[PDB]
Amino acid sequence: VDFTGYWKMLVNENFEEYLRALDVNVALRKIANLLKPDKEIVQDGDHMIIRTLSTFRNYIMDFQVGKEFEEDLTGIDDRKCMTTVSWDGDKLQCVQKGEKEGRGWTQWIEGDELHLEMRVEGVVCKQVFKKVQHHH
Numbered sequence: 001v002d003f004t005g006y007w008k009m010l011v012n013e014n015f016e017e018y019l020r021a022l023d024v025n026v027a028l029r030k031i032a033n034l035l036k037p038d039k040e041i042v043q044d045g046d047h048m049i050i051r052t053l054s055t056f057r058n059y060i061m062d063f064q065v066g067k068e069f070e071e072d073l074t075g076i077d078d079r080k081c082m083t084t085v086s087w088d089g090d091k092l093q094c095v096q097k098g099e100k101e102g103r104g105w106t107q108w109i110e111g112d113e114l115h116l117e118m119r120v121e122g123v124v125c126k127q128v129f130k131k132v133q134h135h136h
């Protein structure tokens with residue numbers, strides 16, 4: 001599996017409850033639900049760069065698969081986590097150790113679709129992106 005590409009958001013399901021489970025305030029929650037970020041991903045061996053891009057915020061993950069790293073989430077839910085992204089078959093599994101229980105996400109590909117499931121304290125958000133070729 002190779003996630004390299006430019007991806008455009010198609011659906012964003014149960015995002016508001018996921019943010020509510022992170023204790024994001026109502027007003028910020030309302031702003032975040034209106035965002036439809038693109039994803040620019042470069043998979044370079046075990047080195048992974050995931051750029052989540054929007055006018056409101058560019059969130060950059062730059063990590064080595066299998067290596068724990070300190071993830072700065074202050075601009076999101078005002079927290080930090082010790083995060084580990086690992087391979088699980090053809091799926092990418094992320095565990096975010098921190099204050100919130102069961103926090104993490106799973107990423108995988110189906111055809112021309114990038115699938116992203118985010119989780120925290122039983123709440124599941126599901127996002128699907130489409131691979132695109134017009135670069136901005």
Ligand SMILES: C[C@@H](c1cccs1)N(C)Cc1nc(C(c2ccccc2)c2ccccc2)no1
Nearest residue numbers: 032035037050052053054057058059075076105
């Ligand atoms: C970005 C996301 C992931 C990146 C790679 C796997 S998940 N993560 C940080 C949690 C998350 N923030 C968001 C979303 C967001 C922004 C502000 C507050 C709460 C959520 C967002 C972040 C950045 C750009 C545009 C919208 N929606 O989800």
